[PDB]
Amino acid sequence: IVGGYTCGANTVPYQVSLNSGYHFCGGSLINSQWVVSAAHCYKSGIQVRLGEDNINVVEGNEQFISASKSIVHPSYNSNTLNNDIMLIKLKSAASLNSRVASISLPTSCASAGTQCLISGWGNTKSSGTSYPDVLKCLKAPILSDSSCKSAYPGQITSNMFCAGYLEGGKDSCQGDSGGPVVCSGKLQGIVSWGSGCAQKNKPGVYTKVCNYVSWIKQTIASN
Ligand SMILES: C[C@H](NCc1ccc(C(=N)N)cc1O)C(=O)O
Numbered sequence: 001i002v003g004g005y006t007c008g009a010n011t012v013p014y015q016v017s018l019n020s021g022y023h024f025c026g027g028s029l030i031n032s033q034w035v036v037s038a039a040h041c042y043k044s045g046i047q048v049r050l051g052e053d054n055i056n057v058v059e060g061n062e063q064f065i066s067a068s069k070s071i072v073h074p075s076y077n078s079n080t081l082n083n084d085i086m087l088i089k090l091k092s093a094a095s096l097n098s099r100v101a102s103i104s105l106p107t108s109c110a111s112a113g114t115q116c117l118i119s120g121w122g123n124t125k126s127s128g129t130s131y132p133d134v135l136k137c138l139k140a141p142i143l144s145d146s147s148c149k150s151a152y153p154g155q156i157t158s159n160m161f162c163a164g165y166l167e168g169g170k171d172s173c174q175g176d177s178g179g180p181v182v183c184s185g186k187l188q189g190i191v192s193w194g195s196g197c198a199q200k201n202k203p204g205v206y207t208k209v210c211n212y213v214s215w216i217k218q219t220i221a222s223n
């Protein structure tokens with residue numbers, strides 16, 4: 001997260017860290033046994049870490065659970081990043097409490113101008129590399145479809161939306177991938193892609209979760 005602020009220990013209870021000997025992607029807990037993340041975050045040997053703040057220190061409240069299976073959307077296209085969504089089933093159910101809780105799936109899509117909260121342990125610098133120990137937060141608005149498409153001509157599908165600031169200076173970044181974009185208590189987006197980080201006229205692009213609610217529910221029910 002570039003241009004954000006320190007969230008505060010366990011203030012984002014649904015945020016998860018995907019770990020393979022190091023933090024490589026974010027994710028969101030949607031129920032005691034399932035996590036939603038980005039398809040481009042797929043890899044074998046994933047350990048899901050819940051209840052984290054400082055990812056380099058065991059502070060208490062953490063729950064480390066191995067992923068039993070990862071389900072990348074069947075129509076995911078790695079070249080266009082269309083359908084960049086993945087479901088991860090935990091080997092064992094997580095213990096839900098005030099520090100580890102699930103986030104609700106949307107019942108309808110969010111409109112332009114809606115303020116959302118984006119979080120992650122990704123790079124905090126626009127020009128360079130600097131990974132934080134603690135979770136970072138950023139409040140950002142969903143942009144109009146016209147502004148999104150003018151920023152990324154011919155690259156925005158109906159399963160994507162832009163969020164952030166055109167003036168630059170505030171945006172999600174590498175390492176935030178797969179993380180949550182929560183608006184009014186509902187998970188509306190997944191950190192997917194963008195051009196660089198916090199560059200002017202180049203807002204972040206996110207997977208439009210409201211288009212996948214039926215797919216998520218039907219997939220979870222059959223696994
Ligand atoms: C696909 C992945 N990039 C992810 C990615 C995520 C967020 C942003 C952003 N500015 N909001 C930019 C990115 O390039 C990667 O190349 O590792």
Ligand SMILES: [Ca+2]
Nearest residue numbers: 054057058059
């Ligand atoms: Ca920790």
Ligand SMILES: [Cu+2]
Nearest residue numbers: 174193194196
């Ligand atoms: Cu990238």
